[PDB]
Amino acid sequence: YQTSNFRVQPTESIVRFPNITNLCPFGEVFNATRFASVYAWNRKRISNC
């Protein structure tokens, strides 16, 4: 009789994501010396990062 099919169950889980390397200066506004006025506020455009 062919009663079943078998498979080895996994021991643990493995999750790998690609490198975040070659980062953009997202901390430029964080380490900036002086900002502008509250009405003069600057908007940092972050694209392809």
Binding site: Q2, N5, R7, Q9, P10
Partner: protein, 49 residues
């Protein structure tokens, strides 16, 4: 030709060998229902039962 008093009898013969090819059996196959849905997952087994 067709006549009442006429008859044809063979004066010589020949031995001919022909070929008929007759299949007997086919390939034995068995398909699993669970592995056909997916393996290594309990979602296929609970929804399949």
């Amino acid at each position: 030709a067709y006549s009442n008093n006429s008859i044809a009898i063979p004066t010589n013969f020949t031995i001919s060998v022909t070929t008929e090819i007759l299949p007997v059996s086919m390939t034995k196959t068995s398909v699993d229902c669970t592995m056909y849905i997916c393996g290594d997952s309990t979602e296929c087994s609970n929804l399949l039962l």
